[PDB]
Amino acid sequence: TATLGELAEAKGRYFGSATDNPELPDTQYTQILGSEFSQITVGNTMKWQYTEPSRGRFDYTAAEEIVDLAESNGQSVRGHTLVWHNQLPSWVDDVPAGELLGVMRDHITHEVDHFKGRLIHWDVVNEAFEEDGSRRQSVFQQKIGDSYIAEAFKAARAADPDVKLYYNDYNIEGIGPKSDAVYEMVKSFKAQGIPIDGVGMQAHLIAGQVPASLQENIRRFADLGVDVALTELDIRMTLPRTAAKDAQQATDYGAVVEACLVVSRCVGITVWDYTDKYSWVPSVFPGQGAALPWDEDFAKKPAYHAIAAALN
Numbered sequence: 161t162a163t164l165g166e167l168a169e170a171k172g173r174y175f176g177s178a179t180d181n182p183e184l185p186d187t188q189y190t191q192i193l194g195s196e197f198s199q200i201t202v203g204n205t206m207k208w209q210y211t212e213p214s215r216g217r218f219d220y221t222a223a224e225e226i227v228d229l230a231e232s233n234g235q236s237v238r239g240h241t242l243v244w245h246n247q248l249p250s251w252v253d254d255v256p257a258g259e260l261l262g263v264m265r266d267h268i269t270h271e272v273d274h275f276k277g278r279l280i281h282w283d284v285v286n287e288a289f290e291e292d293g294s295r296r297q298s299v300f301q302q303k304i305g306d307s308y309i310a311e312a313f314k315a316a317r318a319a320d321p322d323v324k325l326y327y328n329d330y331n332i333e334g335i336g337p338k339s340d341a342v343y344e345m346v347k348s349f350k351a352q353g354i355p356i357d358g359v360g361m362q363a364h365l366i367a368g369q370v371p372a373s374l375q376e377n378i379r380r381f382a383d384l385g386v387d388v389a390l391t392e393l394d395i396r397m398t399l400p401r402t403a404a405k406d407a408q409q410a411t412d413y414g415a416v417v418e419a420c421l422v423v424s425r426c427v428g429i430t431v432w433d434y435t436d437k438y439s440w441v442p443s444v445f446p447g448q449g450a451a452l453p454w455d456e457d458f459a460k461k462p463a464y465h466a467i468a469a470a471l472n
C-alpha cells in the first residue's frame with residue numbers, strides 16, 4: 161500500500177536512502193529507489209576525493225547526476241560530506257599546515273555554493289571524534305587545531321544561509337563518552353553563535369545491540385535546540401541469515417524508528433542504501449552483512465514490515 165516515504169511524510173518526517181552512481185544502471189534498483197523513498201543522500205560523489213581531485217579544480221559531475229535524479233522523483237536531497245578524514249585526495253596532506261584552513265574554507269565554499277538551494281541538509285563535518293570522546297587526530301585537527309570544526313560550519317553558513325548544517329558521526333546513538341563530546345560541542349557552538357542546525361547519528365548498528373538510551377539521547381540533543389536525523393541506518397548481523405536473526409533485526413528496526421517518531425525534532429531516517437545487494441557492510445565488516453530492509457533479490461524482509469508498522 162503506502163511506501164515508507166509516504167508513511168514517514170504523513171508524520172512530518174522523511175524516509176530515504178543513500179545511493180551511488182554505479183548502481184543507477186540497475187533498473188529494478190532505481191524503480192524502487194525512486195518510488196519508495198522521499199529523500200536521497202549522495203553516497204560517494206559529493207566527497208572531497210571526487211569534487212576537488214586536484215587543488216582548486218572542482219568536479220560536481222557525478223554528484224549532479226544523483227541530485228537531478230532525486231529532483232526528478234520529487235525527493236529531497238542531503239549533501240554528504242564536506243570535511244572528512246577519509247576519501248580525501250592525496251594533495252590535501254601536502255598542503256602547508258598554515259594554508260589548510262584557507263583550503264578547507266575554499267573547498268566548502270565552492271561545493272556549498274554550487275548546490276545552493278537544492279539540498280535540505282549538508283553533513284559539514286564527519287567523524288571528528290574518537291570513541292573516548294577526544295578529537296580524532298586527522299589532518300584538519302592536527303594542522304588547524306580544535307577550531308577547524310567551527311570554521312567549517314561558519315564557511316558553510318556563509319555560502320548558503322538556508323540549508324541545514326549537520327555534524328555527522330557514528331556510535332553516538334546511545335548516551336556515552338562519544339555522544340557526550342558531541343553534546344558538549346553543540347552546547348559550546350550554540351553559546352558562541354557558531355552555526356549548526358542538527359546532529360546526524362549515522363546509526364550503523366549491530367543486530368541485538370541497539371542502545372537502549374537511543375531515545376533519551378535524541379531528546380537531549382533536541383532540547384539543545386538542534387534537529388536530529390538518523391543518517392546512515394543499517395543493522396548488520398553475523399552471517400548467515402536465519403529466521404531468528406531476521407526477527408531480531410526487525411525488532412531492532414522498529415525500535416529505532418519508534419525512537420525517532422517520539423522526538424519532535426527527529427526530522428527523518430536514511431538507510432545507507434536499501435538492498436543488501438549494494439550494502440557497504442560486507443566490504444568493511446568481514447563475516448557480517450544482510451543489514452538492510454531489502455535482501456539481494458529485492459525481497460522485503462521482516463525488517464521492512466517492522467519499519468512500516470512503526471511508521472504506522
Ligand SMILES: O[C@@H]1[C@@H](O)[C@H](O[C@@H]2CO[C@@H](O)[C@H](O)[C@H]2O)OC[C@H]1O
Pocket residue numbers: 246287330331362364365366
Ligand atoms: O570508516 C567508518 C567505519 O569505521 C565505521 O564503523 C564503525 C566502527 O565501530 C563499530 O562499532 C561501528 O558499528 C561501525 O559502524 O562506520 C563509519 C565509517 O565512516
Ligand SMILES: O[C@@H]1[C@@H](O)[C@H](O[C@@H]2CO[C@@H](O)[C@H](O)[C@H]2O)OC[C@H]1O
Pocket residue numbers: 203204241286287330362392440
Ligand atoms: O561505497 C562506500 C560508501 O558507502 C561508504 O560510506 C561511508 C559509510 O560510513 C559513513 O560514516 C561515511 O560517512 C560514508 O561515506 O564510504 C566508503 C565507500 O567505499
Ligand SMILES: [Zn+2]
Pocket residue numbers: 219221
Ligand atoms: Zn569528472
Ligand SMILES: [Zn+2]
Pocket residue numbers: 224228
Ligand atoms: Zn543538473
Ligand SMILES: [Zn+2]
Pocket residue numbers: 335336337340
Ligand atoms: Zn555521559
Ligand SMILES: [Zn+2]
Pocket residue numbers: 455456457459
Ligand atoms: Zn531472498
Ligand SMILES: [Zn+2]
Pocket residue numbers: 465
Ligand atoms: Zn508484512
